[PDB]
């Protein structure tokens, strides 16, 4: 897999977390005019520790919405969040240019995986 699940890397893990959060929102409220990739990517990559907490609250609400229905995809997204945050010891105050590039590539890697069968 081009996605490297064994890459315990802080910006990479945050990017994967962003991708799974976006997928969770897309499943909870499909087809909206804007995704969190479209809303919060700026702040998310600017000061991650300042916004990833509220992104996680929103993703928790989305997964709760998913959990009510038989389409409990919700367990996969929640276990993914658990696995990714397990490897993170603390959110960074700021990320450099290379860390932000790593963030973007990790997000795009994880997004590709979730769409795949």
């Amino acid at each position: 897999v081009s996605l490297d699940p064994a890459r315990t890397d802080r910006p990479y893990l945050l990017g994967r977390l962003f991708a799974v959060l976006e997928k969770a929102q897309e499943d909870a409220v499909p087809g909206a005019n804007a995704t969190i990739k479209d809303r919060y990517l700026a702040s998310a990559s600017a000061n991650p520790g300042q916004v990833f907490h509220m992104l996680l609250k929103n993703a928790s609400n989305h997964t709760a919405k998913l959990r009510k229905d038989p389409e409990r995809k919700a367990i996969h997204y929640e276990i993914m969040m658990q696995e990714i945050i397990d490897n993170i010891s603390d959110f960074p105050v700021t990320m450099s240019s290379d860390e932000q590039g790593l963030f973007m590539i990790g997000y795009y890697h994880q997004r590709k995986a979730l769409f795949t069968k």
Partner: protein, 286 residues
Amino acid sequence: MTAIANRYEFVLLFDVENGNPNGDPDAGNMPRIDPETGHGLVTDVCLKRKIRNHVALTKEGAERFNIYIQEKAILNETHERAYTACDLKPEPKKLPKKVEDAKRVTDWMCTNFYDIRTFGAVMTTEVNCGQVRGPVQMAFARSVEPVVPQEVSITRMAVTTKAEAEDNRTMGRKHIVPYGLYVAHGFISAPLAEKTGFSDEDLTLFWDALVNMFEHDRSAARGLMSSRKLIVFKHQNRLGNAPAHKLFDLVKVSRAEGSSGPARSFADYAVTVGQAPEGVEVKEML
């Protein structure tokens, strides 16, 4: 005007905060950068221009202190001034056939215009006033850490010509460096100073200008720019006692111990000046 007698090197530190310190004519107007490493650049030409502006503002055209490159001057009309003041008819496209008159016209150009006396000039164009090398030199300023230029889009609620677009406003953009610390070296040459007439008065004015360079350069695109250090290395003789690079190296620019993340103020940087060689004295007091 007696010439200076000492070889001088200097290090200039200056700031930029939400400003375009120097625009690149090629990248639209983006701040000049080293594309292969991201460090910002300021052409020595820009700093020379700010020095020239300082000279003109503080002396206001006093004798011996005019400047040669101005916002609307015509160089040939200025050279004809030298030819007239030397009583020579301006030889068409050429120097005067007498070498002594050529020297006199060139010296009148040097002895009057401050920036010709300082930075030198290439005046061999049409009416020919000769050449000057300039006792004073300075290299490209280069940031101590890579800068991240960001692009700011703005709008105007009025339009110049007859237009019907305003359906959305007229878009324009500014490029700005969020912050960056620039280290600009420089050099002062006694041997050439003697040949030009660069006196200690001039030199004083020079350091003055350097310290006060940016204070009058405020504009809507410049942001907040300031001079932070002017570490001058005075050699005790005509020809220096220490290699240049060996003195620049005494000036160490690092990031403060308690500073993390992108730099956004001078306080993020720790500046240390070492012990100079016994033939040199340091006047970091500037």
